[PDB]
């Protein structure tokens with residue numbers, strides 16, 4: 001990386017990470033990531049599988065609520081494809097504070113209002129509250 | 145000899161299926177993953193009407209999906225059959241063993257009667273009268289023991305009627321409809337269908353069959369990964385580990401949100417207009433069910449509570465009441481109850497993992513048989529390993545039991561005869577509890 | 591002990607890949623000279639043992655004998671009867687641990703006692719005289735083979751976790767005996783399958 005830094009100076013940024021290899025605390029923090037690596041990989045796989053099941057349900061039934069376009073001329077439907085919907089759920093939904101119900105259309109006054117409510121609340125509980133907390137704990141507990 | 149020689153081929157097929165149950169399970173998991181990978185390429189096209197089309201250019205994905213669906217159904221069926229030929233016999237064996245023990249040593253259906261609460265005894269009542277009982281349990285003379293033990297006080301004829309034993313056969317001095325014991329097979333089906341693993345396999349196969357009606361049902365098979373890895377099974381078990389406490393806590397959350405709904409419906413109704421257009425106001429708290437749903441759905445998932453999702457109380461006579469309302473909703477619901485609900489699951493996960501690690505540590509620091517810690521045996525090099533591999537090894541006790549069973553009683557030595565008598569009487573005083581050869585002869589042996 | 595050791599090494603030596611090289615056809619027949627050369631190449635039999643084994647072998651007019659039948663005739667009875675001698679010597683060694691004559695007698699028997707280590711099972715039981723006693727018995731190879739099966743190991747793991755975590759100190763042995771009965775049935779079923 002030092003030699004590459006002559007090709008482009010910003011490669012020298014990669015040397016800042018040497019501080020994590022020089023202090024015991026930062027080495028412990030780095031080791032805490034891989035301390036529970038197998039469990040962490042399995043948990044992230046379970047999260048991906050659960051979000052895939054939610055994607056399947058939303059692609060079959062709740063497709064009208066995934067229009068992310070303000071202009072009526074050009075609708076940006078996010079769930080007319082399975083890969084687009086899966087990416088939306090994994091990227092926008094998982095990082096959202098309240099789940100996927102925060103990032104899609106309000107179900108009020110619709111025949112699927114109760115199914116949509118159950119969908120959103122279960123996404124919030126299983127994914128946001130349970131699985132993300134477990135993934136975070138697998139690293140914080142390893143550090144401890 | 146056709147129609148009679150086919151039995152060998154059928155038995156070979158059944159043994160092959162039973163011998164590769166786990167391999168078939170792994171193969172089914174792989175096939176389900178492939179099917180769902182193919183399903184990720186679906187898309188919906190109007191060219192009103194919506195048609196699901198597999199957006200691919202190679203053109204081989206639809207035939208591959210059909211082939212994989214058929215393969216998956218076949219694999220699931222063979223997995224069910226292989227389970228029926230590998231693990232069901234053990235389940236029936238355990239059930240018959242417990243039934244026979246209850247008959248002989250408790251008078252479950254003669255001296256006493258099963259409780260009305262438990263369904264096991266009620267269902268088991270169907271088998272004792274059968275001729276095939278016990279089919280897997282080794283002891284084929286349990287009925288005669290029961291009759292000889294209870295006829296004097298309860299009448300041999302009545303016992304023979306209860307156990308379905310012929311009187312002439314009882315006093316003996318030493319067409320397909322009738323041939324098949326339909327009662328025993330109904331009992332066996334009831335025993336199998338209440339087995340958790342067989343139920344899971346049946347559900348798996350049912351979803352495989354439904355996947356031909358609609359391909360997306362194959363997605364339900366991905367959850368098999370949670371039943372295949374220990375970590376994911378622990379995560380699933382952590383949900384129901386504290387199930388009663390979890391249900392009570394969610395009930396308390398619902399009750400508290402109901403109280404907040406009542407307060408907001410009586411007093412703070414002007415702040416629940418969720419419509420930007422003045423022409424059509426979307427009031428969310430002019431009804432109690434609408435307001436309750438709003439508070440439970442929008443409010444609980446909101447980061448700051450319900451004050452985030454309703455009108456600002458500034459410059460209003462109820463500004464301070466509204467502030468107290470919002471802050472208390474944030475504290476009691478968002479901060480306290482949600483955190484407790486989450487902890488009831490995360491702590492259960494941690495507790496289950498701790499129990500597993502503690503079992504592993506207990507096995508590595510104590511002897512399963514005598515219970516003496518490894519500190520005593522570690523005074524010598526590899527003392528604990530030698531003790532638990534040569535002196536007290538549970539596999540050796542299992543092999544000793546097999547040795548006693550397969551040896552003639554006339555050939556039993558003094559020690560074998562002693563242990564066999566204690567086993568027949570079911571007295572477990574011959575296991576070394578808290579003692580060993582080393583402690584017994586510590587001076588002489590060295 | 592020399593008789594037993596000589597006829598217990600025979601199964602190992604005749605089944606060696608070197609012996610298969612010495613009999614490429616694999617018809618179960620070999621000349622006396624080639625059998626002697628194989629025994630010499632193994633380097634486990636002395637000259638007296640080789641001469642004795644050749645004298646035992648019933649050769650043909652062509653100086654050939656079916657070594658498979660030779661081994662079947664001599665190895666099986668030795669494997670059946672030498673276990674008792676092994677158990678006797680093990681019993682004496684363990685109950686006379688500070689004896690010199692016993693060790694000088696056991697030294698010739700090392701190659702016999704080492705053959706029956708897999709087949710010799712030891713347990714300890716609280717005997718009738720209110721003292722712990724050691725019990726020696728025989729273990730069949732099929733028992734180990736079935737004990738190593740995947741389903742049996744699964745059952746053992748489940749039992750160990752259940753009993754240690756929640757079984758309790760009391761009733762642990764009743765549960766263990768029930769597990770033993772269930773596992774004997776499982777091993778019989780696995781042998782059938």
Ligand SMILES: Nc1ncnc2c1ncn2[C@@H]1O[C@H](COP(=O)(O)OP(=O)(O)OP(=O)(O)O)[C@@H](O)[C@H]1O
Nearest residue numbers: 507508510511512513529532536537538743747750
């Ligand atoms: N009575 C005993 N018999 C056998 N092992 C014992 C006994 N008491 C303690 N142990 C210890 O149990 C450990 C063996 O674990 P266990 O019996 O669960 O099977 P395992 O060989 O570890 O498992 P697996 O073969 O499935 O990987 C060893 O450390 C042994 O020291």
Ligand SMILES: Cn1c(=O)c2c(ncn2C)n(C)c1=O
Nearest residue numbers: 282549770771772774775778
């Ligand atoms: C005769 N016998 C068996 O045949 C048997 C058994 N446990 C399993 N089997 C098969 N026991 C305890 C037994 O005494």
Ligand SMILES: [Ca+2]
Nearest residue numbers: 553554555556
């Ligand atoms: Ca006798």
Ligand SMILES: [Zn+2]
Nearest residue numbers: 511513514536
């Ligand atoms: Zn012990």
